[PDB]
Amino acid sequence: RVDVMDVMNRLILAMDLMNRDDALRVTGEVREYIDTVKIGYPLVLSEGMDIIAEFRKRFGCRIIADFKVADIPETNEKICRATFKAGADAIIVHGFPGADSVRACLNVAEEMGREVFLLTEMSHPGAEMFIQGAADEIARMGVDLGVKNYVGPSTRPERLSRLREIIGQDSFLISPGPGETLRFADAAIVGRSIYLADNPAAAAAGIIESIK
Amino acid sequence: RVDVMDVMNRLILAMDLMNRDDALRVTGEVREYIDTVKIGYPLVLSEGMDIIAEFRKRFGCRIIADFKVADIPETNEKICRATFKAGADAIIVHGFPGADSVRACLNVAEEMGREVFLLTEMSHPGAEMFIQGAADEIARMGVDLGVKNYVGPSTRPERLSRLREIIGQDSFLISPGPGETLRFADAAIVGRSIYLADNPAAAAAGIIESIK
């Protein structure tokens, strides 16, 4: 599909290291394989929001800010604006706080020509308490709102199938990573297997060969 | 109660401005009235995490990082660690992602001798979709885990009495403001009516008068 983003090799690097030197080094090594890097609070709080501009200027990669935005609408607006001003191409937002909080993010994205990803579900043990039960409704809330980009877990492939069912084949979906993840998701997110590898470039290359 | 924090005059400043000069100026002006300042991502993402150390060194105020932490346990750990390293006395965490994500924050707080506040409920319109229905259970989850500090809304006083009922009289509870708020909460949080006032110092003093 043409109106959703193109992620090189369907593989997104989760750059979860907290040290700038380490983060830049690994990312540089895999740039021939990956053009989209997901950055979280661990790195930006440790090293500064300026690191986003650094990734983009050094490597020309797309940056997804995995900030799991989860505040009231006014605060969400401010967070999204500060994040997009720093250069992020996209931001990941929680749906649990409801439609107004999501729309606040969509508004700033509209103003600044950036993207919003709705996080529908998480896969860590405690997610079963509240998140899993809300996930389908959060996905539908996104769809009813024209959200185009989603994040789903890939510890349960069949959940991805339900999610893909709700958001349609048109929507852009990314999920952690693998063969059956990519049967549902447009791109897989990979972290440790790359950034902790003795040879990250080889690790990335290896994963892509599997993706065939 | 002695094992819960003392907030000067039961009044917490919500420092929601995004530029460092304005933020420091207002906070300085109210330091005679307020010793506890809540700061959020809008300010720290715009100006850097170093601003926390600045508030503390300049004014000797307690800093609560309103980061609404809402990630998986490992990432929550890293977020709390970076935040406490930067000097925050306390951090606010979402309960919706479940007990393991909260406990991760409690672990780092235990290691570093800092505090965790559990956010039980929000009051913005979209909260009715998912958060309000989960609020009592999130509060009970906090209690079952010995969380001692809580954040609750103050747009519905009766919700505060429900929350106070669940967490007990021993727990520390903070909520937006203030007269009816302080029947239930230990301290009220105030933002705009102080930081946008032509005379913040007078605004603060004015509010404290009404609290007697």
**Domain boundaries defined on chain B:** 1-212
For residue B127, list chain A residues with Cβ-Cβ distance below 8 A: 97-98
Contact B96 A71 (CB under 8 A): no
- Tell me which chain B residue has its CA closest to the CA of residue A77: B42
Contact A34, A13 (CB under 8 A): yes
Buried (b) or exposed (e) across A41-64, using 16+ Cβ within 10 A? bbbbbbbbbebbebbbeebebbbb
| Gap between the Cα atoms of B81 and A180, Å rounded | 35
Find the Cα–Cα–Cα–Cα dihedral A33, A37, A43, A48, rounded to 10°.
110
- Strand A172-176 to strand A149-151: parallel, antiparallel, or no bridges (unpaired)? parallel
Q: Which of A40, A95, A129 sits opposite B99 (nearest CB)?
A: A129
Strand partners, B33: none
The torsion of the CA quartet B199, B201, B202, B207, rounded to 10 degrees, works out to: 120
Between the CA atoms of B37, B41, B46 and B47, what dihedral angle is there, to the nearest 10 degrees? 40
Instruction: Determine the Cα–Cα distance for residues A145 and B41; give it in Å rounded to an integer.
Output: 25
Tokens of A38: 């997901």
Query: What number of CA atoms fall less than 13 Å from residue B28's CA on the CB side?
Result: 9
CA–CA separation, A164 vs A140, rounded Å? 11
Helix, strand, or coil (residue B126) = coil
Two structure tokens written together for A52: 């986003």
Could you tell me if A131 and A156 are in contact, meaning their C-beta atoms sit under 8 angstroms apart? no
Q: Which member of A83, A102, A126 has the closest CB to residue B97?
A: A126
CATH 3.20.20.70 is held by the domain B1-212: yes
Collect all residues from A whose CB is shorter than 8 A from any CB in B.
16, 18, 40-42, 44-46, 48-49, 67-68, 70-73, 75, 78-79, 82-83, 86, 94-102, 122-131, 134, 137-138, 141
B164 phi, psi to nearest 5 deg: -60, -35
Mutate to test the interface with A, among B17, B22, B44, B45 (most CBs of A within 10 A): B45
Whether the CB-CB separation of A28 and A40 falls below 8 Å is answered with no
Count of Cβ atoms closer than 10 Å to residue B159 Cβ: 20
Interface of B with A (CB under 8 A): 16, 18, 40-42, 44-46, 48-49, 67-68, 70-73, 75, 78-79, 82-83, 86, 94-102, 122, 124-131, 134, 137-138, 141
Residue A131's CB: how many other CB atoms inside 10 A?
Answer: 27
Cα B192 to Cα B13: distance, rounded to the nearest angstrom: 9
> Which of A51, A74, A78 would best serve as a mutation to test chain B binding (most B beta carbons within 10 A)?
A78
Read off φ and ψ for residue B140, nearest 5 degrees: -60, -40
Q: In Å, how far are A98, A100, B115 from B34, measured between CA atoms?
A: 33, 32, 19
> This structure's resolution (angstroms)?
1.4
Instruction: Check CB contact under 8 Å for A41 and B75.
Output: yes
CA–CA distance, A19 with B127 (Å, rounded to integer): 36
Between chains, do A130 and B42 touch, taking CB under 8 Å as contact? no
**Residue (of B41, B92, B79) closest to A42 by Cα position:** B79
Q: Do A42 and B99 touch (CB under 8 A)?
A: no
Catalytic choice (A57, A68, A85, A148): A68
Q: How far, in Å, are A15, A127, B126 from residue B169 at the CA level? A: 43, 29, 29
Q: List, in sequence order, the alpha helices (H) in chain B.
A: 20-30, 41-47, 50-59, 73-85, 99-112, 127-144, 157-167, 181-184, 192-195, 200-210
Beta bridge partners of B14: B38
Burial label, A2 (beta-carbon count in 10 A; 0-12, 13-18, 19+): exposed
Q: Looking at chain B, how many residues does it have? A: 212
| Residues whose CB is less than 8 angstroms from the CB of residue B196 and which lie 6 or more positions away in sequence, other chains included | none
Concerning whether A68 is annotated as a catalytic residue, the answer is yes
With the CA atoms of A18, A22, A23 and A24 taken in that order, what torsion angle do they form, in degrees rounded to the nearest 10?
A: 140
How far apart are the C-alpha atoms of A20 and A13, rounded to whole Å?
A: 15
Question: Which amino acid, one-letter code, is at A194?
Answer: I
Backbone angles phi, psi at B15, to 5 degrees: -85, 85
Closest CA to A96 of B127, B142, B95, B93: B127
Output the DSSP codes for B144-171: HTT--EEE--SS-HHHHHHHHHHH-SSS
Q: Kindly identify which residue of chain B lies nearest to residue A85, measuring between CA atoms.
A: B46
Residue B160: exposure state from Cβ atoms within 10 A (0-12, 13-18, ≥19):
buried
